[PDB]
């Protein structure tokens, strides 16, 4: 189980259980649904018949008038003050097992290898914090829509990438399941591999 380095020509030996294992479609899907659910601002509300502004008086004399019987100008059948089952602010976040999360990261990463969307390099950094400088590099590597995962949260690299929409930078500690999918190519530093490896193991 060896992932060939792009340019250094120095193969890197990795765990086949992490980078070489089969794609579990049903598992990966569950972890991606929960991440997106975990991102919601569950912020909304409506008013129940208790919460609409207005009075408590019956409109009618119960009987004798030809109308339909009424109790409340805030009844949900009435124009204004409806909303039978009004909304509250709510928490949409979901549980994921530690192991189902790690297992899921491993499956997706292993697919990345198989689809040749994972790119391993010795180093990945930039000189001065100029987005233009990064842009030049990326074209040279024939990359455009790409996630960068580096060994340490490199700042120059971080600054240079902010205005490039198709480029994101991340330290190994801050990875997540959906980003590793959402980009056409994924770049990892040699150091980045060793940190990801230890984490999933």
């Amino acid at each position: 189980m060896e992932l060939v380095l792009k340019d250094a020509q120095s193969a890197l030996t990795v765990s086949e259980t992490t980078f070489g294992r089969d794609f579990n479609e049903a598992l990966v899907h569950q972890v991606v649904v929960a991440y997106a659910a975990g991102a919601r601002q569950g912020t909304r509300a409506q008013k129940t018949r208790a919460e609409v502004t207005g009075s408590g008086k019956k409109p009618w004399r119960q009987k004798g008038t030809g109308r339909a019987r009424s109790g409340s100008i805030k009844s949900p059948i009435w124009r204004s003050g409806g909303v039978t089952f009004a909304a509250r602010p709510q928490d949409h976040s979901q549980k994921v097992n530690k192991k189902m999360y790690r297992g899921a990261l491993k499956s997706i990463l292993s697919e990345l290898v198989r689809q040749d969307r994972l790119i391993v390099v010795e180093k990945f950094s930039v000189e001065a914090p100029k987005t233009k400088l990064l842009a030049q590099k990326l074209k040279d590597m024939a990359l455009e829509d790409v996630l960068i995962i580096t060994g340490e949260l490199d700042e120059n690299l971080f600054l240079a990438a902010r205005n490039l929409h198709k480029v994101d930078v991340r330290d190994a500690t801050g990875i997540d399941p959906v980003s590793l999918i959402a980009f056409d190519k994924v770049v990892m530093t040699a150091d980045a591999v060793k940190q990801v490896e230890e984490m999933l193991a």
Binding site: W60, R61, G64, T65, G66, R67
Partner: peptide, 27 residues
């Protein structure tokens, strides 16, 4: 200069008191 009319067609007249009132039955 034909501005809509006051109309004053608010209709809270409903509903006035309502006896039969009426036939006697049936005891």
């Amino acid at each position: 200069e034909q501005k809509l009319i006051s109309e004053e067609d608010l209709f809270s007249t409903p509903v006035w008191i309502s006896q039969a009132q009426g036939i006697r039955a049936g005891p």
